[PDB]
């Protein structure tokens with residue numbers, strides 16, 4: 610019931626619902642049109658969504674880098690519904706992210722995370738991700754436009 | 755001034771990225787010029803050049819939050835002898851102008867915490883490390 614699969618265009622509605630649940634949990638805003646945009650992204654772009662049943666997802670983008678022949682991957686969104694956490698779903702999603710980007714010969718996986726999100730940080734650290742390069746923490750700066 | 759690099763400019767861009775990595779003692783892969791020539795040719799990334807002394811490398815990728823892309827300033831560098839004279843400011847100003855032509859919904863930049871001079875530069879030009887009272891971190895795994 611919760612095996613990991615690659616989302617198809619017709620799955621955009623389920624992905625959108627999970628993203629809304631994610632934003633609702635963290636009291637962050639949602640634009641209209643998530644479903645339509647996910648449908649276009651899944652069909653046409655260098656990006657994919659993995660679904661665990663209807664209870665978790667991972668949204669990955671692939672973009673060019675001069676450092677590698679393959680892309681740099683970014684896990685833009687990762688979410689497991691609260692009642693299904695601490696059961697290995699997130700581990701299985703992340704393992705499948707690494708499996709799928711390996712098919713594309715991706716040179717790196719990147720993930721941005723809030724410092725306050727200590728559970729997610731411990732999860733990523735325990736599954737082979739680091740905040741350190743050249744002996745320094747790495748920070749994300751943004752400007753919304 | 756600042757110009758959008760062409761495939762013919764791949765040698766210059768590669769040289770600057772090499773110089774950047776040499777300055778900070780970080781690894782340089784082979785084939786940078788050839789890879790930049792391929793990347794410049796395609797439609798989801800671009801390089802801005804300040805003469806032959808500075809560059810910005812920007813990627814564009816999809817997001818479900820906007821019709822336009824999320825832009826990332828994956829590399830920004832001005833040659834040491836030309837710093838502190840507004841070149842970086844001009845490059846970043848042109849980054850915003852070019853991604854606006856793509857209706858990009860956000861610009862993202864990852865930077866090391868120890869690069870305090872670069873962070874002061876980004877903060878002075880409208881970038882923030884804070885959301886919901888929390889700093890934002892980058893995690894990676896090299897593959």
Ligand SMILES: CC(=O)SCCNC(=O)CCNC(=O)[C@H](O)C(C)(C)COP(=O)(O)OP(=O)(O)OC[C@H]1O[C@@H](n2cnc3c(N)ncnc32)[C@H](O)[C@@H]1OP(=O)(O)O
Pocket residue numbers: 684685686687688689690693694695696697698699700701720721722723726728729731732733735
């Ligand atoms: C770019 C971004 O999206 S960054 C923000 C990341 N997303 C979020 O924070 C959203 C809210 N959180 C979540 O959705 C989840 O907390 C996630 C996605 C971070 C992790 O998902 P989960 O399904 O909880 O992960 P999983 O169960 O595999 O592992 C969590 C812990 O449970 C442990 N665990 C696994 N199976 C079991 C089990 N049967 N019994 C008890 N503990 C278990 C794991 O070992 C892990 O511990 P660790 O973090 O100390 O290594």
Ligand SMILES: CC(=O)SCCNC(=O)CCNC(=O)[C@H](O)C(C)(C)COP(=O)(O)OP(=O)(O)OC[C@H]1O[C@@H](n2cnc3c(N)ncnc32)[C@H](O)[C@@H]1OP(=O)(O)O
Pocket residue numbers: 827828829830831832833836837838839840841842843844863864865866869870871872873874875
């Ligand atoms: C995604 C990334 O590339 S993150 C890393 C960014 N790149 C680097 O740090 C490389 C080293 N530095 C540089 O190449 C340049 O100095 C840049 C790109 C940071 C700024 O370019 P400049 O042409 O110096 O910018 P400009 O003259 O418009 O503004 C000056 C500000 O640049 C910053 N700056 C100047 N020298 C340096 C330096 N050696 N290292 C970092 N930041 C610097 C300071 O904040 C300075 O402001 P101050 O007068 O308060 O010190």
